[PDB]
Amino acid sequence: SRSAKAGLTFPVGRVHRLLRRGNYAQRIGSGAPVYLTAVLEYLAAEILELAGNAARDNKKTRIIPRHLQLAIRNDDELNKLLG
Amino acid sequence: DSGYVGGLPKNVKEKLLSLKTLQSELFEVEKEFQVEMFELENKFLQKYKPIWEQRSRIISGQEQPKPEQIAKGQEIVESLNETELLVDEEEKAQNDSEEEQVKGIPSFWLTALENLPIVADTITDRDAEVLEYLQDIGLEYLTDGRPGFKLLFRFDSSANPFFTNDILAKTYFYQKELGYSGDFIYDHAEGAEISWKDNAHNVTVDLEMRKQRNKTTKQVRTIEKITPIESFFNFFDPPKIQNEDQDEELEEDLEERLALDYSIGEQLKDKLIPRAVDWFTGAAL
Amino acid sequence: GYVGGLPKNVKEKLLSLKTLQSELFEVEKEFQVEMFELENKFLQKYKPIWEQRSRIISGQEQPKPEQIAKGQEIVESLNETELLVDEEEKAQNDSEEEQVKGIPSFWLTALENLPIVADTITDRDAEVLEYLQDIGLEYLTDGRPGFKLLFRFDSSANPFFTNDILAKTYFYQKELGYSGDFIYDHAEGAEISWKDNAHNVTVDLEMRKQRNKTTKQVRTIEKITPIESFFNFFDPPKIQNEDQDEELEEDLEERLALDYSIGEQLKDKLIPRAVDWFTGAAL
Amino acid sequence: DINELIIGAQSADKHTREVAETQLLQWCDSDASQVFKALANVALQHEASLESRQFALLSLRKLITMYWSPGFESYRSTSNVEIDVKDFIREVLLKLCLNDNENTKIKNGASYCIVQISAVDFPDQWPQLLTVIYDAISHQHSLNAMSLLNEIYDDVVSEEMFFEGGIGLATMEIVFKVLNTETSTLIAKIAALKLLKACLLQMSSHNEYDEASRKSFVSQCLATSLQILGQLLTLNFGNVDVISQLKFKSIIYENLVFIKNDFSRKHFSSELQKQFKIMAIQDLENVTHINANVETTESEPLLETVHDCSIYIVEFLTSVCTLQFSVEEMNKIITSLTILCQLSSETREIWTSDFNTFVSKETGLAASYNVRDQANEFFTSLPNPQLSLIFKVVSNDIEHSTCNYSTLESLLYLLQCILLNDDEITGENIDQSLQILIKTLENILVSQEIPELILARAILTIPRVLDKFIDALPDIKPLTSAFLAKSLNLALKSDKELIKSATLIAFTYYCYFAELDSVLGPEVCSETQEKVIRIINQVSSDAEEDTNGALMEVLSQVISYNPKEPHSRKEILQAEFHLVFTISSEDPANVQVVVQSQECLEKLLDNINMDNYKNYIELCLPSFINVLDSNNANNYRYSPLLSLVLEFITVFLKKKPNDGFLPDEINQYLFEPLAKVLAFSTEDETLQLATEAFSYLIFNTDTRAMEPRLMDIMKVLERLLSLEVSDSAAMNVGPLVVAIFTRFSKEIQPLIGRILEAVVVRLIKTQNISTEQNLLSVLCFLTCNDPKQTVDFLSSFQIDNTDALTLVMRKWIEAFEVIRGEKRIKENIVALSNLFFLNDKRLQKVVVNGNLIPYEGDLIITRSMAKKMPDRYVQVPLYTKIIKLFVSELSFQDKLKEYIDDESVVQLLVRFFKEVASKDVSGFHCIYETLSDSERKVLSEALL
Amino acid sequence: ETYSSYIYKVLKQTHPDTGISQKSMSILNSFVNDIFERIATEASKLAAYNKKSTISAREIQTAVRLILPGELAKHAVSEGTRAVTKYSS
Amino acid sequence: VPTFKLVLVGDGGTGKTTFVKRHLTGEFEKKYIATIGVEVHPLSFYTNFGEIKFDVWDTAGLEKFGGLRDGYYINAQCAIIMFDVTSRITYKNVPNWHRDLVRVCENIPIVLCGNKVDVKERKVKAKTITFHRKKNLQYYDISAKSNYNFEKPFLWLARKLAGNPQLEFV
Ligand SMILES: Nc1nc2c(ncn2[C@@H]2O[C@H](COP(=O)(O)OP(=O)(O)OP(=O)(O)O)[C@@H](O)[C@H]2O)c(=O)[nH]1
Ligand SMILES: [Mg+2]
């Protein structure tokens, strides 16, 4: 798949379709979605990492939304990005 | 166990031969069963056709809901969970003149296809451009001629700028004999040659054109290049076999392409159209 | 979401679509009725062949030279040259051949070659199933839909239980399961009337003769403890869901999944294809 | 053990308080039941100090949420709280709440806990609660039980459990029974009426379409409540406990207005409206006569309570004001109101002592709301047939009271409230009454005996009389002129600031209902302006609160009447500017004064002409420079008047640049203080305003006059790029550097290194994106000017003793991946062309690390993960990366050279590649070898 | 919207021991889509400013740099470039 | 010297901590750090008639940090309810804060302060400000940056507590 070719897990196709639905430009570069897919998979990686960190801060393996919130607390730049 | 099989007495061996014969007779009975199921499925397709036709008219906006059907839809909404359809006070203040500015369902079949798991992954944005003009998807069972089912995609020539064909169709064929499990087994498929308005509007190839005062051949010549590309409309024109190339190259071709083609066709015919409304809204997932 | 947010033309059209969908559902119910009629009709044709092969396997009926030969062409075309007769086998006398009437452990071998059900068979189960004479299938017509399975044992010579025929029933839910098929609902089966606990292969036996240390009475004890076996196919999970069975319902759901997989395997492969699975060619 | 915890947790000292709180939470986590029971015991014992008992109940209310039941959103686990202890606490809390022996603080704490427990338990898990409450109310008329039930209604009862649950019918039955019992004490009836208010509040969220089970219940309850209230209003209680009688009347009328407003017209019939109207008028009259008993001073709250009750009675009369009123009941209403709307001796003394409070109340900005406001609401609301009759009544009563100095002020206020109603007062004899009214008002003006406040009210109410009746008065113009002149003369002669401010506000009303210039004539209008500015001068010396805002509004009105230029008078413009400046700078933080000075100042500069621009310059500019110097002494700390000053400095500079350059007077005045502001200041808003002003000044001042201060604009550029200012301030540089390049196009070249050093040092330090392109656009712009001079600085300039090219080329071309915008991007292409065509060996070979070489593995490298697998890059030379970026945007928009030889980004950059191929083949081929095939093609096909 | 399985994969790759609730995936996905939409809107702003009107790698790097804080943005850009390079190879 | 406990109370984020900090040191504070628990800051004012002293209990306005919050109101003699003119939710929170103050200490004098008036973007105005007119508690519009009405709440409270309407600060 294109995601595997890009070295990404998250869907390049869904990113491209979400980009399409906004009609953000008259023609689309194949680099735009792949790049963005990687950016958002990076945000997922960072958020998740802090989320697991918080979960273990809660002495456990299972994350729930409170623990995502404390993950956002643990990293101020996500705090200002997500509010 | 070959040792055991050799160990079986002769008498048990003709017994097993007769049992194999009984299995074969059951195979012919399965063939008749499949014939009867195909005939009755075609009959029920004929039974189905008007309701698909009516919902297609609704999808295209050619027909307007009548308040009995509106009320029946409302009471179905009250069942399970479809409260999205309950009309609010704000919309009742609207007028048909404002609402009918957009006629039909925008990108109904596009979203219905792109909600289908296996098929959606093949639809590029260039393909999706044509699917915007898709307004109907019909099924036809090849009762006449070789057995199979044919998929129909409909368009408006006066609307779409890509091709002059109002209807694009894809065909699947089965072999004359049933499979080992008793289900139908497939034969090579065929697809229609789309009458593209121009090669620029073609979606299944990439072109390059260039002019050279070619010093090598003393030719002031123009060169055009055409290269097939991956696209959903490659679903049509399926591969065919040439014996010498079939043995080496097209063996892997039939191993890969035919499986995906048949799976996509089966998914469409079974999952999609009977629940096209639910696939459109995603409730069929 | 935004489809709802669109003006009321969109809601009314999709309400009409839902009305038409209910109409599709009614027509599809009638389609299911017509099909179930059709599989019942062709199951009436299926049954004679299964009974004939079962009688052949049990030895109550003998083949015919035409059947033998036409099986010969069939085998030659299949390339399964293992079944071919050899002159050494032909040398066997009629007395040697007639020492066994039926095929020894035919159904046992077929189930052993069967992928999952083979795992359930134990040594005592293998011994017992030699007394199995037929596997039959039936459709449930009255009331709620379902299908039934049946097994036949020669209870006269069977030293394990007196049950001449054991039947297993499978069930579907009342309305149309989504995607146009039926989804499972709970199954029921019979109880095996074991001749004794020693021959009860669903139970391991302990024999104790004791003089009670407290009351100083004299007693002889026969003790029972259930064990897994191919006949755990019978005594299926009790009910789909009930207030008192939840703790049981966990294992009931697990065993329901396993038992429906087993029954679907039976219905699709073994009853329609028994000879190849016995010979292992179906592998 | 619990005792020292509750003592320590009360301590002001942070350490003891924090440690006690933490020990308490730890102990409650270990065994919740022990701590809960200990707290309940402390709350129960009378031996403990009441502070300890309050602390126990409040802390227990907190601890319940986290350790009582998982139905709470909070639920701190390990909550061992058995049904045993929960029942003990449920018992103890009722025993505290319902005991009359307990202090109201303990009752309130206990009810506060019962309300929390009810949140998760009320209708299903604690059924004894309502049984005990209803028993106490119904059989003992317990006030505590009614208060507790009222709190329950406030905080935990809900619509579904009110209507479909049992709560509503049971409560309404209990309430009606308590009100119907003659033996029930009056205070119990008051409590039951409050509880009735709560029930009505629940019932109000209803609709005509709803369930009949709700609808019929609502209808029947409203009918019974109206019957009971009508019956209650007939009771009388004599002299005993008049305060409670007033509170009883007050709550009855509050319920009646609630029923009148919040429910359908069918639930409160018109005939019942008439009956309650009669009873309301009679209750108003009665409440007035207790106000004569007020003179006994039997209890101080008596006057307060009389006014509070009358507020609700007048509010009910407002709600039913569409009903017809007979003449005698209008007389009763008017008499009662003249007694009620009378100013107290306290308010009279306050207004006489400090006119600022009078001004604040009169202008409508005072916070207080009282019976005079409700009378304003009543008269403002009357329809025409009622209003025309009430006006005759009040005007007639003014005539007969002219001899009294007690009721005349109230009567004038009542007339004022009548005249603010929007309808037209028309009738058979309003001509005659109106003539008498204007005559008596004129006599109030003439008389010397009149006390201050009657005179002030008359001054304020004549504008209203003229405005309302402007069509009925046949000679409105001379009347208006004479009244205005007389009022102004009195204000000038008077030594009371109160009458002066009253006259100023009345002037505002004349400016409201008439164009003064047309009605007075130009000379009289000019003399009026002179008088008004004189009075403002006299009043302004003692303005406080909203008086500055009011003075600024009246000054705005004065300014709007200034004559046109061919007859404009210099000194009145000077006076207007002096007043706006002085009033504003006297209260610089008052935002309303600042904004109104904004409108006033823009009006003054609206008559601006190039024919009189010098005069305005010389008039304004010294004062603004004084402001700048006075803020300089205060270190330019935020003062929003300084903000407005700077804004109008900018716009003043933008008004008349019709000459190619603004007059050098503006430069001479502004440049030194304005640079003194860009230097020696440290705040975002002040520097933002000062830099836009200074940039606009540079944008239109003469280069020849500005050359002497060119080093100063250098200091501005450097200190604005210096890290003394925030990056927020730094981003503003764009306009100013563009301006200097416009106005020093040729003179800037010798100093560009001083430009370059500041721009680069901020560049490498900043991580703010939008900042660095702005600096990089400049650095692009420098090389578009001359890349040779730019680089000589770049090569010579250093940070951390390393050549700036090693710093700039990498960071600039790294950011060239995010530089965006066609012109800006064109500036880059021109910049790179200037570089590439300079072609010194540095440009040919400096490594700009242009190519990524990703770290291995498809896992996504987090910031933390980058600490052990950082991404890696390839040190390609400058030309390699830049051309890749070039051809890339060409994509988004020597054998080749042989075939090439046979205004917009694409046109702009293609010649560069043509020019490159025309001037450096070897580099072009060298770069070609580093170029990718897809880029090679695009480069080829674009050139072709 | 659903990125559930890919969220699982990223979680294991970053924390093999860790579990995650469906509601947590929904919230994370909401964050993902909101950040996608803001980045894409800024990219469209760029594509509108310049007649080029084509969105590729560049405008996205710009939008990520403008929107994300510096330390998030640097490695987000790093991963974007990594994926683009891996795709292009 | 008469000293009074003043509990400064009000929604989180609204300006309580910087207001006290400026009265204490005179310098504004741009950034937001949520207070946890309470800080007690002893203020002082020099007046005519002598001296006024306050201990200001600056409470955490965030419920996640309002640990044992009502227990701080026990011996309060006066209070300030602070809301923010630019965020209407903080104003709608006002009646609840007032009720919580009353429940613990019934009849102390209360003053209501609308902070951050020094921005053009104010979302609630004096017209909507009506909770005072009913409960009869003083109301002022203040700001901590520009020091508009900077000392009036304390002046009004000191006049009310000392019972001396001629009191004024110097
Ligand atoms: N412009 C302006 N900002 C102000 C003003 N008063 C406070 N601020 C800002 O608002 C914030 C003050 O909130 P804090 O005092 O920290 O918060 P709080 O209201 O005590 O609430 P918690 O800390 O949550 O208990 C700071 O960021 C100040 O810069 C003002 O009058 N004007
Ligand atoms: Mg704070």
Kindly describe this structure.
It is classed as transport protein. Keywords: Histone, Chaperone, Import, Nucleosome Assembly, transport protein. The assembly is hexameric. The entry is titled "Cryo-EM structure of yeast (Nap1)2-H2A-H2B-Kap114-RanGTP". Chain A is Histone H2A. The organism of A is Saccharomyces cerevisiae. Chain A is mostly helical. Chain A is 70% helix and 5% strand. With 285 residues, chain B is α+β, with helices and mostly antiparallel strands. Chain B has one domain (7-281): Arylsulfatase, C-terminal domain (2-Layer Sandwich). Chain B is flat and about 85 Å long. Chain D has 944 residues and is mostly helical. Chain D has a two-stranded antiparallel sheet with strand order 1-2. A two-stranded antiparallel sheet of chain D has the order 3-4. In chain D, strand 1 (798-799) and strand 2 (802-803) form a beta hairpin. In chain D, helix 7 crosses helix 8, helix 13 runs antiparallel to helix 14 (270-293) and helix 46 packs across helix 50. Chain D is flat. With 170 residues, chain F is α/β, with parallel strands linked by helices. Chain F contains 5 helices and 6 strands, in the order E-H-E-E-E-H-H-E-H-E-H. Chain F has helices at residues 16-25, 88-92, 94-104, 131-135, 152-162; strands at residues 3-10, 38-47, 50-59, 78-84, 110-115, 138-141. Chain F has a 6-stranded mixed β-sheet, with helices on both faces. The longest helix of chain F is centred in the middle third of the chain and has 11 residues, at 94-104. The two termini of chain F are 17 Å apart. At the B-C interface, helix 1, helix 2, helix 3, helix 5 and helix 10 of B face helix 2, helix 3 and helix 10 of C. Strand 1 of chain A pairs parallel with strand 2 of chain E, so a sheet runs across the interface. The structure holds guanosine-5'-triphosphate and magnesium ion. Magnesium ion binds next to loops of chain F. Guanosine-5'-triphosphate (GTP) is lined by residues 12-18, 29-32, 34-35, 60-62, 115-116, 118-119, 143-145 of chain F.
